[PDB]
Structure 1
Amino acid sequence: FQQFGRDIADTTDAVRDPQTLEILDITPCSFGGVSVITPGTNTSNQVAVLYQDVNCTEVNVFQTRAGCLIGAEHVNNSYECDIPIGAGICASYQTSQSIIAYTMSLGAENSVAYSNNS
């Protein structure tokens, strides 16, 4: 005898079709903020757009945990963070010149020589 479901926070998230009794699930269609990643206008005039928390179907397209990044070329290297984005991903204007998104490097690798006599 139940018609429509509800959530813990009192949000409609399940409806049964009247004509054909069958359970359906309701999820709102995607939304999110928009951010623009740019260097100084003195340096250049090229920009990149980060679509926050939206899946790369509703819009050089790159996928991150923060969102869908457009206009940045992925690389294999690792540099110091310049313009933070999220989840350890940073972007900078580097050489020709373009915008690259990478994984930030914590520091230089080291290993001190240890022994019980030195």
Structure 2
Amino acid sequence: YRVVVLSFELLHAPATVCGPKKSTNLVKNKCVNFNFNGLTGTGVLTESNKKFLPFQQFGRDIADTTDAVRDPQTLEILDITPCSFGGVSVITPGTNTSNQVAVLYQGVNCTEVNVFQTRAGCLIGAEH
């Protein structure tokens, strides 16, 4: 009977034996949950023309947000962008006159949401 005893050391020391790391295909130009080299987040990915230095693995905003990243498998650079969001104001006359309303989606296009695109956002239900 051939026997192997694998004794594993779990100490307060850095690890040298590591398990396999799962991977998935890179979905681009879509709102997705992403995990790049342990960095977890939610957003869409786009192709970027930036040229990160080889050691650099992440991109940072004027504040602390990460804008760009390097894909581990394919060395192409991908820049991140927040999944769209905004307020939904309801444009209504007095209910004693009419119950008809128009909905304004602040600071968004008319694709993510009688449609009138304005600088304030995408207006739906109101005639131009």
Aligned to 2:99: 45
Q: Does 1:7 align with 2:68?
A: no
Would you say how many aligned residue pairs link Structure 1 and Structure 2? Answer: 74
Equivalent residue for 1:31, pick from 60, 82, 85:
85
Q: Provide the alpha-carbon RMSD of the alignment.
A: 0.8
Inter-partner Cα distance in structure 2 for 1:72 and 1:25: 36
Return 5+ residue gaps in structure 1 as ranges.
75-118
Question: Hey, what's the Cα distance between the residues in 2 that align with 1:42 and 1:7?
Answer: 49
Amino-acid identity (%) = 99
What TM-score do the two structures reach when normalised by structure 1?
0.60
| Aligned residue in 2 for 1:67 | 121
Name the CA distance, whole Å, in 2 between partners of 1:7 and 1:53.
Answer: 21
Which has the larger strand fraction? Answer: 2
Shift of residue 61, structure 1, vs aligned partner: 0.6
The CA deviation at 1:66 is 0.2
Q: Which amino acid aligns with 1:23?
A: I
State how 1:70-109 maps to structure 2 within 5 Å: 70-74=124-128
2:112 match: secondary structure: coil
Q: Match for residue 100 of structure 1?
A: none
CA shift at 1:2, angstroms? Answer: 1.2
| CA distance in structure 2 between the partners assigned to 1:5 and 1:12 by the alignment | 5
In the other structure, the counterpart of 2:32 is none
Task: Kindly state the Cα deviation for residue 33 of structure 1 after the two structures are TM-superposed.
Answer: 0.5
State the 4+ residue runs in structure 1 displaced beyond 3 angstroms.
none
Q: C-alpha separation between the residues in 1 aligned to 2:101 and 2:89? A: 10
Task: Quote how far apart the aligned CAs of 1:44 are.
Answer: 1.2
Give me the whole-angstrom Cα distance separating, in 1, the residues matched to 2:62 and 2:102.
39
TM superposition shift of 1:32: 0.4
